[model samples]
Target chain A: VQAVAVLKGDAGVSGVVKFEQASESEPTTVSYEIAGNSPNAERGFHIHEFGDATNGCVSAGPHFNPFKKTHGAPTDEVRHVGDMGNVKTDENGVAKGSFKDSLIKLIGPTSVVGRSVVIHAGQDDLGKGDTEESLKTGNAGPRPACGVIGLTN
Target chain B: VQAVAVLKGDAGVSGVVKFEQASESEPTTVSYEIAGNSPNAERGFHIHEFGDATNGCVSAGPHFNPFKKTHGAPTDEVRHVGDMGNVKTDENGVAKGSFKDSLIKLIGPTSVVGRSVVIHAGQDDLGKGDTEESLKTGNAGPRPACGVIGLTN
Candidate 1:
């Protein structure tokens, strides 16, 4: 399944993310390519809990942490199921890459089908030695970008 | 020789105003009809300069008073050419009415062909009040509604 994202707050950014069941490379996969975010910036991108984008990115709720785990990296054993990690943008504000996560499935209860893909204005702290908010939002600032995950032809 | 008006703010409101040549009843005339406004509310409606509804109603500039005249009623000769006065809504928030304005012409410098119809949240004092805004916008309050005039069938 593939879904596109449109940036809000006049940031002029947009992209698409694809979640696959199985691949020869990994057990599960999510491919993404974003453009026109922030020039030379590493943005915190993740699948949020809600798909509502009516009030811009502010209404998307929180990260889709179905596992009730900490906001860890993609390789960590205990982490948010939606915590796929960061996307680095060049001077032109374009970030494109793909990764595999065994947790993310397009079907079933833990599916990310009706969630949201929120891109932040700052980097995600990754729930490390940081203080409070580590267990929650990963300390990402100002969600200047976002898009809902929906079925596409 | 006809124009249209598309209401602004929320998409739930919309309408059109027509300016046409003289019929059998009178001389040259500008007739108007609109709908989808506040329910059971009396809205201040008027023709504004600039047909651009780009930035909602604020980008429509001011009233379509090309003659540098103060805001007045439709029957008054000293009023702005665009000041056709208010359009009252019914219980369902619909303002459906028409008028034959001899002051509005289809072919002239004061033509409302490229103008707009701005709807207000409150009533237009028609510059007949004690407040300072009465001489200006008639203290019509926030412009929660607006529409651009365009050519149509």
Candidate 2:
């Protein structure tokens, strides 16, 4: 049987993000489009564990790294399941982009069932730097905006 | 098999988001969790027809209307397949929530194969009343945040 899920925020900004789960046998792909006013100059995109909206973005925990690997580029052969690259906004402060990956699953051992998305005020650098070398995907930058992932009834 | 899916968003004004799918098939139950930020003040949530993130959230299309009915409350018994409900953030401006619905499936026609999860900055009235009707969840507010829903490898 085919099913669908959705997530929504409060009433302060504008724009919407979306995701699609194909068949269990196929690779899970994700895509999105969003626009909003930014307090910072730019924003970074990332996936984190946990959903503690109260603790700000820090409550989300680290990236989805069930494999305990190093952070790398989105195309890297081995990277953190949370390594989804980034999405840059336009001069209007609007961000739009879509990407697909197999790091997430609808059913399996290494799944991102309870995690959060961490938007940053800087750039990710795509895990291509020295420093923390956070393995799966370098510990990009600071979190600017945030939201929790949930299933629809 | 029992499984869970996880979706995360970036922090601050960054418009980055990620999704992972996992599953288990005993009572044919599928669950998901989300954590992330809203650039503005609030965000809305919804499901889409496809995973096309090209036109931002538009490519995903409006909520799935498999039943060909008008958008209504999630508990209305008869509503759109995308009518899951809404999630809000706290005073600090953080959005986080987790929900479980036995309506999810991994395979077969009931599978949510090509559906997507969208977050908005507005509220989804839920078809109660323009004012404030407890019967309906009320509008989700605005489209302040967004993300696509998908499965993992």
Candidate 3:
């Protein structure tokens, strides 16, 4: 199995963003943690498209879905590879979570080598039932915060 | 309105990242942009948590969500703020995109002043419908690439 990938960053007052690949082999395992600076206690998180930094983080486009699939829960088999699940910040404004999947690849046609990670000002519904599978995650909402993915040394 | 923040880096390739206020007075309106590269064509992009110098560019975190949000479209009001839409690369692998919102602040509570930007190896769904909110902007797939979000001088 290949070594895991680790990503990190600081959104200023928003706190710190950390990404790591628990396993790069089969059933690839990816994990992430966030330490925010707000007292809100929680914030939204997910993967976005295009790393274009022309218009701020907005130019990155939409979520990281290349298969043209609908937005579903991270447990859904038909969900986008960018759908890694959610991260919950603590009372002091910190959150942590991890996920393991086979659909994601570190170095392949489905590799997420150059994508990005974003932080929201709200929560992710996970698209369970309230709205459509798409609405489940609640549209991308506002970019309360943002960060880019990079390899760790 | 406050001036937008722009930052650039080469986590494995050459590119740029930008940040701006969602509104002139609102703390929200933190947006982003990206451009220039070798691949030329549009590739997947996102914001990882860390910076990986050894494993190429595998050190960033999953997504930048301090909150546990689901993966869906970017137009959803309940979606994650980290879901800043997608980035479309040109034929030369050069991609570009933008995100705007009032969920984050530029100087106070929800500022993303020191985050990272990531570039992916594939395209974003743009939430076309094949996935959850097809009509939504970003639903693409897989994080083919990545980068970090930094501040300007």
Q: Which candidate is the best by DockQ?
A: 3
The local distance difference test score of each candidate is 0.65, 0.51, 0.49
Instruction: Give the C-alpha lDDT of model 1.
Output: 0.65
The window of 10 residues in a row where model 1 chain A has the poorest summed lDDT is: A1-10
Model 3 DockQ class: incorrect
lDDT of 1 by residue, B37-139 (tens): 6788777878777544335567667777767887777777777777767788898887877778776664544555445667777787787988756766777
Error of 3 at B127 (Å): 49
Instruction: Put down candidate 2 lDDT per residue, A48-98, tens digits, no spaces.
Output: 765434445665677777788776666887777777776667767677666
Which stretches of model 1 miss by more than 4 angstroms? A1-9, A22-26, B1-153
Q: How do the residues B1-153 of candidate 3 rate in per-residue lDDT, one tens digit apiece?
A: 232223344533455555555443554433344555435455444444344433334444554444555444456565444555555656665555555665443444333433344555445554444655433324443343444443222
Model 2: which docking level applies? incorrect
Task: Flag regions of model 2 displaced more than 4 Å.
Answer: A1-15, A37-43, A133-139, B1-153
Number of the top candidate by TM-score?
Answer: 1
- List RMSD in Å for every model shown: 18.1, 10.6, 19.0
Per-residue lDDT of model 1, residues A36-88, tens digit only: 77778788888787654445578677788877888877677877887766789
TM-score of each: 0.49, 0.47, 0.46
Per-residue lDDT of candidate 3, residues A39-119 (tens digit): 545444666664444455565467777788767667787677676655655577666655667666554445554455666
DockQ of each: 0.02, 0.05, 0.13
